[PDB]
Ligand binder design. Sequence first.
Ligand SMILES: Oc1ccc(CN2CCc3ccccc3C2)cc1
Ligand SMILES: Oc1ccc(CN2CCc3ccccc3C2)cc1
Ligand SMILES: Oc1ccc(CN2CCc3ccccc3C2)cc1
Length: 460
Amino acid sequence: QPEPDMITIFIGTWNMGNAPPPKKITSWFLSKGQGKTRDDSADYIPHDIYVIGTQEDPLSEKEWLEILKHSLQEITSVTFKTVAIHTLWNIRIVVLAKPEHENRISHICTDNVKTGIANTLGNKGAVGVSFMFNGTSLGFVNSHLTSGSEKKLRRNQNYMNILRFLALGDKKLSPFNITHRFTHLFWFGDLNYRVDLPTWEAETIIQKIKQQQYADLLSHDQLLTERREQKVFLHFEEEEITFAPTYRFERLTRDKYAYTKQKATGMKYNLPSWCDRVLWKSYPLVHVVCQSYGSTSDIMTSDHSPVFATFEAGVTSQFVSKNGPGTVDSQGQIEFLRCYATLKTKSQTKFYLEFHSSCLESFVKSQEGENEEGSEGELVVKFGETLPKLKPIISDPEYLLDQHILISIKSSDSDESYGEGCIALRLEATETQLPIYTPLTHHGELTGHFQGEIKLQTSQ
Ligand SMILES: Oc1ccc(CN2CCc3ccccc3C2)cc1
Ligand SMILES: Oc1ccc(CN2CCc3ccccc3C2)cc1
Ligand SMILES: Oc1ccc(CN2CCc3ccccc3C2)cc1
């Protein structure tokens, strides 16, 4: 059996509204309903990996796993294997995979983050799973963020707490948060961002939904506007939304949105909103294509409709050579020329770089850069030609061109990262000086840039 170079991944997010599901939920896993839906001709073709995120989930783990497995069994005639299940309060993540992948999956990690403080600690937060699939690292986050139209800034703070504190992936990547640890990271959930229009416009909104005219509503979606203004989810992608708002429905139908203020809502309006979302972030120049993004129309036990998204995702093979793993391949090298960082810092410490990659035996520390004052105030940290020559473990171009180098710029005084980024080795040419670039972030916010030239030598 050849190792795959692509897999398909199903992502589901459903806020179940504390109610048991209906007897049939197969439409969710088939990507059928409204939006970008899956072709009927693919119904019997299993995805490689199913990742199910629930919020307000009233079921036990056993009860939900039996429903999920029996659903997929009916659709595909495949008995899926449980990779991981993790629950925080009523927030849950399940990862299922084809049985043929059991030996391809390793380094399974789970974690959760509880958001907020006192009053605001005890039901919101996130759960996550990571693992390796052959040579590819995969991360998955299911978050239930703070509710309420007037709490977008709290949701943004919940996001930053989750990506700072969720401990997934390779712990050796100590300067890096989850936004840099994975070849592919999927972040989904009841993110709770709302369509920010006046309360008086509720019936106008409903009209627009009935006309399938989502444009004037999406222009006020808080997640899209906060992303455009770089307030949250920096460097994540979302597929275009072409389905109706998934919240807040009257239960047992999808014919009615329940938006008006009630004691049960804390006297808050719930204008129709796209609360339930799937976003992703993949390393540069790795294949990732969204092939469905939509909501079901026939699952009506909750005041939310389930959301689905599916992806093609590039994967690589667990490379063995005569040499690496367990030695270098003197044939291979990575050289850096004319490199500098630009930092948005008022500090004047010296800085050095660390280079982290699973193509290295271990991470490499550079010498200190030369600080220069940027013409518009910034700090320019010059490395020129001084950066180390990296010695990959395998020099075969079929391996090396698929790799990535994580970069952290650290203070010499404190050894704290001021910025993290990633460079693809998927170059247009080898043995050729070529421009490289990454933005640098810390705690998920932009802190600067790294740029220069690279020179990659492979065995070919
Ligand atoms: O080649 C690229 C360059 C920039 C982006 C990031 N995008 C750009 C547009 C946009 C609009 C609204 C909210 C977020 C974003 C983020 C993606 C690909
Ligand atoms: O107020 C200023 C006046 C001159 C410079 C010029 N330097 C020179 C070298 C260099 C190397 C790498 C990146 C940038 C630069 C810019 C910068 C700021
Ligand atoms: O450590 C170095 C890194 C890059 C360069 C080459 N470039 C970088 C950009 C720039 C901008 C403005 C004036 C000059 C330059 C010189 C030189 C030294």
